[PDB]
Design a protein around this ligand. Structure first.
Ligand SMILES: CC(=O)N[C@H]1[C@H](O[C@H]2[C@H](O)[C@H]3[NH+]=C(C)O[C@H]3O[C@@H]2CO)O[C@H](CO)[C@@H](O)[C@@H]1O
Ligand SMILES: CC(=O)N[C@H]1[C@H](O[C@H]2[C@H](O)[C@H]3[NH+]=C(C)O[C@H]3O[C@@H]2CO)O[C@H](CO)[C@@H](O)[C@@H]1O
Ligand code: NA
Ligand code: NA
Lengths: 528, 528
C-alpha cells in the first residue's frame, strides 16, 4: 500500500508485538495476526519501536517477534491488506522499558531509521508513546520532535501525510507539564493526540459544582470524561489545548488491559461525548490498549470476545466527520516581574503559529502598555489572527522595587584618643543602581578624647533625585585604656584598705567585708 | 504556656510519635524527647493526629506513644518549655495510613476534638498533612476546612492566633489540583504552607531557557528550588499562588528521611533563596522531615549529627522579617462557552477576598462586555482592590452556535398508487430553538401513480428571521407491485418459450440457451 491516512473519526487499537501478555487481573492477551483485527479499528498501532540492544546504539528500531508466526514478508502483506481496506498502521515508539535516551545530534539518525522502517513495512505514520522515564530523559524532548519534523516534511515532498499521533498519560498534559515540548514543537504536524486516561489512579481534577473528579471513580465516569476533555479542548483548567478535532480518548479494553480507568458502563462515555457534541466540540475518537486485550481472555479463561469494539465502534464511526478548529496559537506569554526603571520589551520571547504550524510571529500585536518607571501592575493583551480566527491572551507585568542594604554599621567600641572615621568599613548597595556609598550621610559625631557612648544616625538617600531614604543607627563607645581597681563582687572578701570599682566610683574598705555593696553602707559604713 | 505563634521566619521540624523508624537507605530514626530538639527549630510539628481505632469512630485523635518514655504530664511539661522559649508546637493531622475519611456533619466533632487536644496539651496550632488517598476521600475536602475555620475563630475570640499550616506534596498545588479547596476555603486563616518538595521523583516543571527541571535532579537543584517557588509565589506556570511571606520550603534532612529530594549541596538552596530575595520575594522558611531523622543514624550506625539544622538554621534565621503581601484574590473566573442568543451574566460564580479572608465580592468590577447575539470571542477583565493592592484577572467568553439536525430523511421505496406524505416521520431540532419541523420546506414532488425515482430536496430555515439554511436530499422510488417474469441469470439454462426479464424488457428464448445476455444476440439470435 501507499501512505494511508485517516480523515474521519478514528477507533485506534494497539497491537502487541509479543504473545501471552499477563493481565492486571490474571487474564491473558495472545498475539494475533494483523488480519484478524476487527475492521472497525481503523488505526492499528504496532507496539513497539524501542532500543532492542544497547549494543546496536541509541537509535531505536523495530524487530518483529517471530514467535507470532508471521514471516517478515507475511507481516508486510497483512499491512498491505489493512491499507487496501483504507485502514492505517502506525509504528508506536516507546512503551514500558523503552531504553530511549537520545542525545542532541541523533535527530538525523532517528529520522532515517523511521523512513527506512516506513518504507520497508508500509507504515502510515508514528505514535509517540513514551513511558514516564523516557518523556524527559537526556534530550528526547528535543531529538524526537526534530526527527519527526524531517519525516513529516520528507513524505510531504511526495504528496503524502505521514501521520503523527501521541499517547501521553493525561497528567502530563497540564500547562507546563512534561509533554509540553512535544505538543509545542510538533504543533501543526500532528494528526491527533490520544491521551491515556487510565493507570493514573486518583489523579483527576477539581470542578466547582461537583468537587474532585478522579480517573478511578466509577460513580463519576461521565463527569470525568466530560470535564477532562472540555478542559483539554478549550485549554482551560490548567491543561494544554488540544483542539477537539484532534482529541481521541484513550481507554483500556477491559479490567485486564490496565490497573484503572476501564469504563464499566459505556453509557457514561456516550453521554459525555454527546455533551461535547452539544457544545459544538465533538471529539475525534476513542483509542484503546489494546486489540489483543479485546481479543483476550480473563483469568477464568473466558474470552473477552471484542467487548470494547462492541461498545464503541458503531458509536464513534456513526458520527459526522471532523470540522477543523483553525484557531492560531500564541507562545511564551508568562506573567512577568520587572524591576523599577529597567528596560522591558513586550515582544521578546513571544511567538505564534497558525493551525498548520506556520510561524506567524510577525503578525502578533499587543494592546496596553507598561511604565518601567512606576512601581505597580500593568496588563497587556496579545493577539494574532490567521484564517479568520483570532486568539488573544493576556499578560501581567508587575514593576517592583528593591530596598538597598547597608554594611559595616555595627555597634563598635574604641579607645580614647584614637582616630575614628565613621565611614571606615561602611557602604551601601542596590542591585540596579550599584555602589551607593557616596549617598550616605552621618548625623552626630564621636569625640574620641571624651569617654562615653556616641549615637550616629546613618542615612542613605537613593532613587531618582535621591528622594527615597532609609535609616540605620550605630553606637560608638569610647573607653579608657587606663587600668584601674578591680570591680567589686558580692562573693569576694575584702580587708581594710582594699579598693574596688563599683558603679563608677572607687571605694576603700574600712575593715573586713563580704557581700556589702559599695554605695549602700551609708555615711559611716565599711565603704568610703 | 499560652498560644505561641511565629511572626518571623520559621525552620519547621516534624517530630515522630514513634521510635526507631527505618530509613529509605537502611538508617534509623529514634524517638527523642521534645526538649532535646535543637532550639533553632522554632516550629515543631507532632506527628500525627489520626484515627487510631475505626471502633472509636471517624474523628481522629492523638495518642502519645508511651514507649517514648514521656508520661502524659511530662510531655505537657516539655511543650510548656518550648512555649516559654517562644517556640510553637503544632499538631500534625494525617501522615501515611491516616484512616481519615470524614462525612459532612462531622465538622463540629472534629473542631471540638481539636480544641480539646490544644487545651489539654498546649498546642499552638495544626498542620494539615494528609497523605495522598486522604486529600480527597469522602468529604475531607469540605469537613477539615469547615472545622478549622471554627477553631481559628474560637481562639480569635480570646485574642489568640491558633496557627494553621499545611504540608501538601508539591504536585497537588497546580491550579485545579487536589489541594485546591484547602487553600481556597482557608484563605486568610492560614499562617504558612510548607509544601513537601520530596518523594515525587521526576515530577517538576518545564522552563523555557532550561527545559525540564525535575525534583530528583541533583544537577539542577538551584533551578528546581528557584523556579518552583517563583511559580508558587506569583501563581504562574499553572500553580496556585502562595504569597512568598507564606511559603516555607519543605525538605528531607538526609537520604534516609525520604526517597528523593534531599539537597546534596546546601549552596543550591542559599542561592535559590537569595535569587528570590533579589526579586523582592524572600521566602518565609524551610521545613523538614524530620527532627528525628536529623538526630538519627545511617545504616553504618553513623549519627547524622544535626546536619540539616547545621546547613540551614542560621541561614533562615538571619533574614529580615517577613513583609506581608496584601494582594486580594479573585475566584471562579474560568474561560467560558455560551451559546448564541443565550442570557449570560458576568458576575455569576465570581467571588473575591482580601488577604485576611474577608469576603469582598461586592467590590468586584468588570471591564469589557459580551454580545450573546454575535458568534465570536469576547474578553473581560475583573478587578478588585483592598488595602491598596489590586488584582486583575482576565476571562474569555466564546459565543458559538450549533447546527440543527434533520430526522426521517432516509431514502425510501414505496408502492404504486399508495399515498405519500413527504413530511411523514420527518422533523428538525436545535438545542435552543427546539422543534423546527414547521421550518422545513420540500422541493420536488412524488407521483406515486408513475413508476420511477423521485428526488426531493428538504430545506430547513433556522435562526433569526429564518435566514440560515441547511439542505438534505432524499430519493423516493415508486415501484410496481405487479409480478412479472424472473430475471435472467447467466447461470440458468432456458428453453424454447421460456421468458425472462432483463434490462427492462421481457425476452422469449427461441431454443436451448445458457449464458447469453438478452439484448446482445442481434436480430436473429436466441432472445427476442
Ligand atoms: C497489561 C499489559 O498489557 N501490560 C503490558 C504493557 O502495557 C502498557 C503500555 O506499555 C503503555 N502504552 C500504552 C499506549 O498504554 C500504556 O500502559 C499499558 C499498561 O496497561 O506494555 C509492556 C511493554 O511496554 C508489556 O510488557 C506488558 O505486558
Ligand atoms: C522514612 C520515614 O520516616 N518514614 C515514615 C513516614 O514518613 C512520611 C510522612 O508520613 C509524610 N508526612 C510528611 C510531612 O512527609 C511525608 O513523607 C514521609 C516519608 O519520607 O511516616 C509514616 C507514618 O505516617 C512512618 O511510619 C514512616 O516510618
Ligand atoms: Na502504508
Ligand atoms: Na501553647
Amino acid at each position: 500500500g501507499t501512505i494511508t491516512s485517516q480523515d474521519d473519526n478514528v477507533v485506534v487499537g494497539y497491537w502487541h508485538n509479543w504473545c501471552d501478555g499477563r493481565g492486571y487481573q490474571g487474564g491473558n492477551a495472545p498475539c494475533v495476526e494483523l488480519k484478524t483485527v476487527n475492521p472497525q479499528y481503523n488505526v492499528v498501532n504496532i507496539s513497539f519501536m524501542k532500543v532492542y540492544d544497547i549494543a546496536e546504539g541509541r537509535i531505536p528500531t523495530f524487530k518483529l517477534d517471530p514467535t507470532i508466526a508471521l514471516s517478515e514478508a507475511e507481516f508486510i502483506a497483512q499491512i498491505d491488506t489493512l491499507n487496501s481496506q483504507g485502514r492505517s498502521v502506525l509504528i508506536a515508539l516507546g512503551g514500558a522499558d523503552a531504553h530511549i535516551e537520545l542525545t542532541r545530534g541523533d535527530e538525523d539518525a532517528l529520522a532515517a531509521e523511521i523512513i527506512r522502517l516506513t518504507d520497508l513495512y508500509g507504515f502510515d505514520g508514528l505514535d509517540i508513546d513514551l513511558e514516564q522515564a523516557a518523556i524527559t530523559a537526556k534530550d528526547n524532548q528535543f531529538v524526537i520532535p526534530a526527527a519527526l519534523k524531517m519525516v513529516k516534511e520528507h513524505y510531504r515532498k511526495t504528496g503524502d501525510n505521514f501521520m503523527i499521533t501521541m499517547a501521553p498519560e493525561f497528567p502530563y498534559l497540564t500547562a507546563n507539564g512534561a509533554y509540553t515540548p512535544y505538543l509545542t514543537e510538533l504543533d501543526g504536524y500532528y494528526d491527533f493526540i490520544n491521551p491515556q486516561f487510565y493507570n493514573q489512579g486518583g489523579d483527576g481534577l477539581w470542578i466547582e459544582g461537583v468537587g474532585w473528579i478522579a480517573q478511578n471513580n466509577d460513580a463519576l465516569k461521565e463527569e470525568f470524561i466530560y470535564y477532562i476533555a472540555d478542559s483539554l479542548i478549550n485549554g482551560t483548567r490548567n491543561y494544554h489545548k488540544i483542539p477537539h478535532d484532534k482529541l481521541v480518548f484513550g481507554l483500556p479494553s477491559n479490567i485486564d488491559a490496565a490497573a484503572t480507568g476501564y469504563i464499566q458502563d459505556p453509557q457514561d462515555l456516550y453521554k459525555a461525548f454527546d455533551r461535547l457534541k452539544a457544545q459544538g466540540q465533538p471529539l475525534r475518537g476513542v483509542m484503546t490498549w489494546s486489540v489483543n486485550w479485546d481479543m483476550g481472555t480473563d483469568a477464568a479463561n473466558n474470552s473477552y470476545n471484542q467487548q470494547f469494539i462492541k461498545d464503541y465502534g458503531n458509536f464513534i464511526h456513526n458520527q459526522l466527520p471532523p470540522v477543523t478548529d483553525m484557531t492560531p496559537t500564541l507562545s511564551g506569554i508568562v506573567d512577568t516581574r520587572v524591576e523599577l526603571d529597567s528596560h522591558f520589551d513586550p515582544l521578546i520571547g513571544i511567538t505564534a503559529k497558525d493551525y498548520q504550524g506556520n510561524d506567524i510571529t510577525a503578525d502578533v500585536t499587543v494592546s496596553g502598555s507598561v511604565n518601567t518607571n512606576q512601581v505597580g501592575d500593568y496588563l497587556l493583551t496579545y493577539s494574532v489572527s490567521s484564517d479568520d480566527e483570532t486568539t488573544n491572551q493576556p499578560r501581567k507585568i508587575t514593576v517592583y522595587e528593591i530596598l538597598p542594604a547597608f554594611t559595616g554599621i555595627t555597634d563598635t567600641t574604641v579607645v580614647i584618643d584614637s582616630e575614628f572615621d565613621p565611614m571606615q568599613g561602611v557602604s551601601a548597595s542596590h542591585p540596579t543602581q550599584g555602589d551607593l556609598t557616596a549617598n550616605i550621610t552621618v548625623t552626630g559625631e564621636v569625640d574620641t578624647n571624651v569617654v562615653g557612648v556616641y549615637e550616629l544616625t546613618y542615612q542613605l538617600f537613593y532613587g531618582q533625585d535621591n528622594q527615597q531614604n532609609m535609616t540605620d543607627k550605630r553606637i560608638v563607645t569610647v573607653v579608657t585604656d587606663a587600668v584601674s581597681d578591680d570591680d567589686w563582687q558580692v562573693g569576694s572578701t575584702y580587708v581594710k584598705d582594699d579598693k574596688v570599682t563599683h558603679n563608677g566610683a572607687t571605694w576603700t574598705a574600712q575593715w573586713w567585708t563580704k557581700g556589702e555593696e559599695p554605695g549602700t553602707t551609708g555615711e559611716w559604713g565599711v565603704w568610703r
